[PDB]
Amino acid sequence: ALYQIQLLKDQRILGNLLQPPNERPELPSGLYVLGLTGISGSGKSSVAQRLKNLGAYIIDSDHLGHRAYAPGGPAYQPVVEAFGTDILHKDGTINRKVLGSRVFGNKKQMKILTDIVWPVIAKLAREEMDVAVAKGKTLCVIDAAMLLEAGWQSMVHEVWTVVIPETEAVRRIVERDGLSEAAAQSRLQSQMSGQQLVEQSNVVLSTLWESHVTQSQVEKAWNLLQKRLP
Numbered sequence: 001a002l003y004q005i006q007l008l009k010d011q012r013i014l015g016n017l018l019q020p021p022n023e024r025p026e027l028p029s030g031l032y033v034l035g036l037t038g039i040s041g042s043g044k045s046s047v048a049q050r051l052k053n054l055g056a057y058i059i060d061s062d063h064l065g066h067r068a069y070a071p072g073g074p075a076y077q078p079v080v081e082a083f084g085t086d087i088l089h090k091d092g093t094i095n096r097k098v099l100g101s102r103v104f105g106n107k108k109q110m111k112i113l114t115d116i117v118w119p120v121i122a123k124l125a126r127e128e129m130d131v132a133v134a135k136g137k138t139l140c141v142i143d144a145a146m147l148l149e150a151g152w153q154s155m156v157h158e159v160w161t162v163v164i165p166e167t168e169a170v171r172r173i174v175e176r177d178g179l180s181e182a183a184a185q186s187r188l189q190s191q192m193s194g195q196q197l198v199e200q201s202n203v204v205l206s207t208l209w210e211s212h213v214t215q216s217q218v219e220k221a222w223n224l225l226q227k228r229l230p
């Protein structure tokens with residue numbers, strides 16, 4: 001039988017367990033948790049969807065964030081206090097285009113925001129996992145761009161990172177988001193490098209190759225995971 005495997009060098013086999021999982025006494029007893037992260041342009045949402053198709057319960061942190069500071073949500077009042085009512089649409093919802101203009105590319109302002117929002121999202125993620133476990137789910141994935149920067153590896157058994165070369169990342173960002181190349185590198189500089197992410201990962205994946213190769217990696221990763229679940 002002839003086949004190909006995917007590797008990262010400076011060897012790490014993509015899909016394999018690279019270092020031991022974390023012990024997590026505080027998580028619900030029936031539940032295994034993956035933290036899924038990657039650099040912008042990594043295509044990690046494609047990977048999250050493939051894990052969803054295999055049966056994982058996905059918690060999308062970006063969405064939880066938007067709900068956290070929806071009117072009625074725990075972060076609404078603090079975010080509006082911290083940034084002012086000029087960030088609000090006419091209907092009183094946060095205008096994320098205006099908020100983004102305040103914080104993107106701006107280290108101090110983004111920190112005012114994430115100091116408020118990240119703890120709120122982490123709490124909402126913990127709540128969602130509890131509900132999922134009550135409804136019989138046994139494997140949860142917290143999909144988060146800034147997982148390691150937020151310290152959220154404390155909430156997961158395994159960190160899974162989706163990586164691609166920085167040149168392809170910048171290309172995907174510039175093209176798909178209509179960013180200037182400087183805005184794209186600004187985005188990338190404002191987060192951990194692929195190598196930093198890899199070093200702190202239990203499993204590494206890549207969307208560098210065509211879609212069928214990504215699927216194969218994810219299936220291989222999923223199968224190995226299943227055999228090491230408690």
Ligand SMILES: CC(=O)SCCNC(=O)CCNC(=O)[C@H](O)C(C)(C)COP(=O)(O)OP(=O)(O)OC[C@H]1O[C@@H](n2cnc3c(N)ncnc32)[C@H](O)[C@@H]1OP(=O)(O)O
Binds near residue numbers: 065117118144
């Ligand atoms: C720990 C976590 O990962 S929590 C989930 C991420 N959320 C946060 O960090 C909270 C702060 N960010 C926000 O509130 C919003 O991103 C806003 C208001 C700044 C912008 O909102 P929107 O314009 O709707 O952008 P959206 O939320 O879709 O994010 C756009 C991109 O910026 C990224 N991004 C979001 N927050 C951050 C951050 N703190 N630092 C760097 N990049 C970020 C997103 O992951 C997304 O990347 P993608 O296009 O590769 O998926």
